[PDB]
Structures are given as structure tokens and as C-alpha cells.
Amino acid sequence: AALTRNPQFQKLQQWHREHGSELNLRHLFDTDKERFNHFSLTLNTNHGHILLDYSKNLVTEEVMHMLLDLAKSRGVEAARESMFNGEKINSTEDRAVLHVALRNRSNTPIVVDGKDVMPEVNKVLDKMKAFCQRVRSGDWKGYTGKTITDVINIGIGGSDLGPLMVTEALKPYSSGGPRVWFVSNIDGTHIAKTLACLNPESSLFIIASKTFTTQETITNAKTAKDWFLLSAKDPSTVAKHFVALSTNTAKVKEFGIDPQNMFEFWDWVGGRYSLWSAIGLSIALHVGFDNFEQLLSGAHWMDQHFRTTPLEKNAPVLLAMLGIWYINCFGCETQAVLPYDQYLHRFAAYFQQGDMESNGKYITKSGARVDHQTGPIVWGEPGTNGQHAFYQLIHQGTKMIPCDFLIPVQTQHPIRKGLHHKILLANFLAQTEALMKGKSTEEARKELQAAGKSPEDLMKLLPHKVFEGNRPTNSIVFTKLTPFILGALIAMYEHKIFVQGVVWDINSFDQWGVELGKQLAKKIEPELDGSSPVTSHDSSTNGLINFIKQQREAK
Amino acid sequence: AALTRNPQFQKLQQWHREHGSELNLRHLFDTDKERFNHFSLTLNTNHGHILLDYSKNLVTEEVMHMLLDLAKSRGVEAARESMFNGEKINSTEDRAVLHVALRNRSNTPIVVDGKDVMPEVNKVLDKMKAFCQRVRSGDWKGYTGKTITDVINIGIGGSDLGPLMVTEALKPYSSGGPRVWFVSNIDGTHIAKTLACLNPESSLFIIASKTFTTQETITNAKTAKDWFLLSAKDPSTVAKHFVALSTNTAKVKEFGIDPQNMFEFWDWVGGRYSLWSAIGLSIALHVGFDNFEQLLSGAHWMDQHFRTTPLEKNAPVLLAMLGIWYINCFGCETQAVLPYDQYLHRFAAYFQQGDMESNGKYITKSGARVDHQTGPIVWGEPGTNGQHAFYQLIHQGTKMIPCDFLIPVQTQHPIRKGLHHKILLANFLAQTEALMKGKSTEEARKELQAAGKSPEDLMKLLPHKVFEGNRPTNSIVFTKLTPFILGALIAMYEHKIFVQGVVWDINSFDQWGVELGKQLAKKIEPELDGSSPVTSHDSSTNGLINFIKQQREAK
């Protein structure tokens, strides 16, 4: 494994074993009035500012310099160029990795197999916009002449999470668009509950699937089509209510979808990096194409920042190395994402796939098994709610949990003259402050006494009211959560994930870890039919199956 | 500082560092045809069966024997009795812990300092039912005479999560109840977007708050009240549109809500254990009281199972110790909860509070600092959805992640003649099998050769196709997800949490870790006012506040 052999990494490791343990945030802040200044970065996008404050982290100039040396010696910069230049860095699949090309507004050429990719990219974007305009304008009618009122996206992986998260995040910008629904789970209640609120005459289904062979999506699509034709009665009417987003023309046609109703993307577009491609059709339909182009632009802006900025002032690089520090030196298993924005309620879930499916690996690009930790477990819920659910464990638990706090300065809903947002911001600020500062035995004791506690209560409560603090957090504050800023925020993390993948020398763009489950599932499906017990598996799988056959009857 | 010195704990520890890394699930099943039989328990509740299959765990009779010795060695049973008996086991607050009283269907007496609590418990249940009856029948009219069509629950944390999770999970049983909304975040966006869809004339607001002073809920409540009073203007109309669930009568009255409109509970009802009390009013309104009683009965059934079952056959006890095993011996930081049911999409979020806010502690009951791990980080998403998001990391990542897979045998929507559910069950089964069995290099190699891949391509890809397996999981299968069954499942985990807290000797029923953030938030709140720079905090908090003030009016 490259990482553990790297001299910059080893130097980092020994420093941690002989210093890291004594690092204390409160102390660091008390002895360096320039800490915020030295450990924060402000980005002016001309469309809002983004403040990345990483000063509340367990680091020093020395640690940062070492972390940055490591990034450099692991070839982060060269790796980045190869990605942008269209090289097939996805080594196990021999594929290019060009999600940056999907939002390359500069249209600077990017050649893969001797051919520039942009023309195809823009071609689909035009197709998307033209189609979106017709549906939005009402020009596009159903099989009964009615205009489309509901758009239903049926997809699962990177074919669901992104479009769902962004549409939720940008609701304030969906003024003139139809209602968008998202169906993904094979679980029947999902599609059933949806179709129950729809009129086939005014419903448009979007079959989103890179491969167009995923069982859940195809089954859901077929179910939606059956339900539809039950009323439309003429297979020819399908061309007015079903479109597909995929890279597989054959499967699409085989499904029965008109080829002009196919918005394609490419193999170098990873599912978990696809919302920027045709997969984002439901977004464009929801917020309009202008807002969608803003989304792409924001990501493009971030891509430029990542590409042209020296490492020491490079946002995604800084976040990545801060993560490496906690994962590989402090051994923290998780990474919490806590946005203080109800609209971003699906932000954390999106990066569970983005981050975990990318770096949840254990084999390097050379074929060697890692002998160090890789991708963390990403989780989180919107602020303040989380404060009333799990922060208890973050503040007084036994796990070190790196936290990323995000919040827009300006709210999309300044009700009560900004009272609500003022309180939201106060909590956002106070939480990272509290995690950092903590509360000593003495401070607690004085509070208890001042509060008028009796010698008994105080003595009883004292130890329980002590906060050891020293809990690291990142504070990412942006002027406003607009399509452009959101676009830049997502791209920022996409690049953080990329950097970490390079440091660990793993392929952040394949996902072989999903094959085993799929194949075993294919084996079990036919065995479930009938009441005959099964015994071709281990005793657990057999036992579970037999219980299912038995209880299938129970009334 | 109690568990680490327990004879059984140390014996358990020594065994692990001596054998722990030797355990291999695949080997354990390959050498014991009775494994499933010996490491699983079936529960017939008379209202459905629940199969807890814990055979795919890294354990043997010996390990389970030692784990159970630790359970009784730490006084789990005496502790259990104290809770049910009404003793003040919530030591730091000197309170009883009686959520089991809330659903005590047998009405056996349970006396707290003075009287038997059952009388007041049933008194509120009767009141809830009568009100619920009036609201659903249409008897209870809005201020202009219309029947109420929307019920808006306003609460946070324990006052929002249980209600939301249960109503989401029991959607199939609502037929007839008004639509229910849940407002919780202070973030203005939450109440703003909720109110924009309501008619003041037919909306009924439920202010859920145990203390009735939390800032988010009261603020949200005032905003709603103003909103309403903006179109009705008559303050006296409020009595037909606002009710309260709380233990604080004075504050409820001060808020402007009449007594008759207050559904109370008591201090021995922990917020994260309150959906069983008046807090469940929105659940009752949504699915009817018959179903609500069914929900309570299910919990009550599990309560009895927990109290009368020998430890080795006690479901919550087994789940608790397996957790202790992975937490304290394998050092696993997290617990994944993966229900293969879209209706349970909020189940994991619910227990993030129930578990994490309960056991995310570091001070024992004696006041000593723990020198071992406590509560884990709970997380998850409904399957198969997850299978396409983060399972990659669970299968080929670098972290051990204990996983609880849950699923109903019978679906609420058997569409397409059960095809969707069949596939859902197939994946449910195949995933734990895959996590267990893995796929060796030899197996992967055969596979690649059969695919006709040249030696070069084959060997470059081979290591990436290997699944080391040996990933432990629990499979919980129940006949159907009915109100009764959900209730038992929730109570089952409540008790798993109780047992673990007992073993760690922490107070699973207080939550002092949330106080610091609240104190600090009130401090900076007024400081946000004005354009003048703040310099009273650490440079980061100051820098963040000043960035906010600067961008507050940026265009």
C-alpha cells in the first residue's frame, strides 16, 4: 500500500503519536488571536461568498504543512489534471471520469478517445432544455390532450438521490414547474402510494438508469407502464408519457421507449456524480433550465477553484486532508454533515453514497490490500433538530466525531422579520463554540452555585454537567443557498472525496462491492416461490426463508 | 469505572483478544448445521410472529454464555425490576422511568411517591380518545364551523420523531383521519412551507412540548398562533384551533391555551420515550384510537416478554449484549439499522435519539468517568435503497459495522401479485448472506476465467472482486408491520438500550449534554443584532458572526 510507505505520512504519524494527544482547541484559541485568520478561507464567487472556517480543528500550522506535504507527495495535483484531461483514471473499469465535463460551461475541449466530449454534452443539454420548455409551457400534452401536471422520476442509485436532494434543496426556485415525485425502492409501497395520487393522462414518467438493467428501476418502470396502459389502452400512447435517461440505447428501446425520448449520458459519468447530466432532467423540470444552468455554473466555479488554487488555499484539498488527519491518525470512523437548513434535509444522505460508495474500498490501484483506514461513515440530520436527538452523544459521548456545520446567512423565508433565522444562526454558532470550549468542573460548579443549587443537588449533578469539549468542527457559511451556491457546495465535496481517494491510492470511481449481493439475490428469488422448505444455503438463510414461507400464510 | 473491573467483563475481554480475530462466520456455519437453530429465537405475540435471527453474529455458545454472565453480573434484572416498580432510577434528576406505565394495558398498580399512576395515565388516554373522536367525526368544528382537515403537530426532538415516525410507518391504517403535518425545526422554512398549504379555518395545531419552554417549539407556536390570529383576529377562537401536550400546565395556560385543551403527561416520561403518552395524540388522530391502543398493546407485550423471560431467551437482552460485544470488544463505533420497508424510512432517525441521547454518556451513576466505550452512533436508510448508496463500504470498506436488517413478511401493498415484495425479500436475505459468506480469491478467479478474461485483465481486476465477508448482522423478521407489531419492535429497542445503559452503569434517562449549546445560543442571539462587530468570543465564533453581519445584506 502506497500511503503507509510514504515518508510524509509516516512523519505525520509519529508527530501525532508524540503530540496530537495534547492538542486542545480552547487552549489553541486562547493563545493565538490570529487562529481564525490563519485557519479559514473566504471564497468570492461573484454570486455569493462561502466561508470555510476550519479553525476549530485539532491542528496547527505545522500539522497543516505536513498534511499538505502528504497531499503533494501522493500526487494529488497530477491526479487532478488526469481527471480533467479525460484520462481513464477509473483503472478497474478503464474509464475516464468526467463529471466536470458535464458542467464545463467554458466549453474548453476535453478529448477522451481522440474526440472532444463537449459537443455531445451540450447537445443533450439542449435536448433537455427544449423538452423542459415544452412540458412546462403545456405544449407537450398527454394522450388525452391535457398538459403535464406531475413528473415522476423512477431510479435508485445516483439515479435518485441527487435529483431528489437538489429539488428539495431548491424548492423556492420551482415556481412554474409541475410536481415532481421520486420513486426508487423496489418495495411496492413506494410506487403504489405515488400512482395513487396520479392521473395517467397528466403524468410523465422519467426512467432514470445509467445501465437501464437495474432490477428495482426496471420493475418499477414496468409497473408504472402497466398501470398507465390500463387506462391509455394503446401502446403507442407511451411515447407521450415515458422518457429515459441512460447510456444504454438497446435496453431503452427494448423497454419500449422512443429513442427521441432518450436523454443519454456517458460511461465516464458515475451514477453518484450524475445529477449534472441527463439524470438532472427532473431538476431542470422543477426549477427551470436557467436555474439548472446556475447549478452547473456553481459546480464549474468550484471545479476551477480546485484546479487553479495552490493546495494551501484549496478548499476541497483542505477538507480532504482534515479528514485524512481524523481518519488515519485519530482513527475516527465517522463524518457528520449537519446543515442548518431544512431544505437540505437530504444533503447528508446524498453524500452517504457520494462519499461511502466512492471511498468504501480496501484495494489500491496497484492491487494491494490497504493496511490503513479508508472512507468514513457519513451521517447527519438538519440543525437544530439533531440538537434534540443525538448531539448529546456528540457533546458527552465516548466517540470523537468530526462535524461539518453548514448554513446560509440569508434565509429563503425571513418570516417574523428574521426572528427564526436569527435563532437558527445563534444555535449554529453556539454549537461549534460549545463543542470547542466545553465546560470545566469549576465552571460548572460556579454555575450550579449561582443558580442557587443546594449543596446536595450541586454535588450530585456536578460531574454530569462537565463538558470536556475539544470536539473539532468545520463551519461552512455561505451568503445564500442558491442553485449556484448549492452547485458549488456539492462539487466542493465531490472534490474532497476525490482527493482522499488519491491519498489512499484507491479507485474512488468503481463499485464492485455491490455485485455479490445482487447475484445471491438472483439465486434466492425463484426459491421463494412455493411452500417447499429450502436447504441450499447456510442454516440462517434457509431458516429465514422457511420462516417467510410459513408466515406468508398466517392471518 | 465499574464494568472494566467486573470479573465477567475482564474474562470476556481476555477471551476476545485471544480468540476474537479467529471467529469466522462462514466457518461457523460450515461446521455446525444447527447454528441457526441455536442462535435465533421466534416470538409468537398472538398478533404476529417475530423471528430474531442472531446467528450471523461472531459468537459461539461460550461467548454468549459469557455475555449473559456479564448481564446478570451487572444487575440487569434488578435494574429492570426497579424501573417497572416505579423506583427513581433517573438518579441525576431523581425521577422514575415509567414509559412502561403509559402502555400498561393490564393496569397492574405502579406507585410513584404516593399514588398509583395508572389512574391518571388512563384518564389522559380517555380524554385523548374523546377528543380524537370529536375531531375525526366532525363534531369539533373550526371557528367558522368547518370540520378540521389538517392537524399540525409542533414539537422537536422527543416531541417530534416518535409521532412522525409512527404515522409514517402506519400510513395504511389512517383511512379516515385528517392529514397530519410535523413542524419541528426553528428554521423558518419548516413552518413557512407548512402554513402556506393550510386553511386557518380547518387547521388544528398541536403544541407538543414536555417542558413547554424549549425555544424552537414555543417560537414556532407563537408564529402559528399569529398566523392564525391574523385571519381570525378574535383571540377567543384560538380555543378551537390549539391544544397542548405537556407536563407544564402553568406555561400552557400562560401561552394562552385553556386547560380543557391540555393533554398532560408526567416527568417520569422521557421525551424520547413519550410517543406512548399524550405526545401520541397526532398518531391517534391519524390512525384512530383502536390502532393507537394496538400500538400500546404491542409495546406492553414486549415489556412483559422482557420482564418474564430468562435472559438467554430475552430478545432485548440478547440484542443489548451482542451490541456490548461489538462496542466494547470489537470497538465498533456504529450500529446500522436497515429496515427493508419504505414506511419505516424514519425508524433509524427515531432511534438516533432514543439510543444516542440515552447512552451517549461518559459519567457513571456513581459520578465516575467511564474508561470504556458507551452508546454507538446509530444510522441507516431503508433497503434496498441503501444497497445502492453505502453498502459498498459495508461490503468492501475498512470498518466493522454491526447491522440490524428488519422486514415484514407480508406487505401492505402486494401489487403485481407480490412481485415487488418477493424481490424485496430476496435482497433482504441475499445481503446478509453476502455479508456473511463473502467471495474468496479462488471463487472470484473461477468467475473471471468463466468470463473469458485474459490473464492480464483477470489478475488486474481479481483483488477488487474479492469479498472478505465475515460481516455480522441480525435479521429481524415479523409477519406484518401492524400497529401492534411496530409497538413491540420499538419497545424491544427501548429495552435493548436500557440493558446496555445498565451494563455501562450510566444514566440512560437524563440528557445534560444539551445544556451548554442552549446557554451559549442565548448569549450570541442578541449579539447578532446590529452591524457592529463582535469580539467577545474566540476568533472563530467572532469571525463567523462578523462574516454573517457582513453578508446579511449582501445582494
Ligand SMILES: O=P(O)(O)OC[C@H]1O[C@](O)(CO)[C@@H](O)[C@@H]1O
Ligand atoms: O442508474 P443505474 O445504472 O440503474 O444504477 C443504480 C445505482 O447503483 C449502483 O450501480 C451501485 O449501487 C450505482 O453506482 C448507481 O447510482
Ligand SMILES: O=P(O)(O)OC[C@H]1O[C@](O)(CO)[C@@H](O)[C@@H]1O
Ligand atoms: O419541548 P420538550 O418536549 O420539553 O423537549 C425538547 C426535546 O429536546 C430535548 O430536551 C433534548 O434534546 C429532548 O429530551 C426533548 O424531547
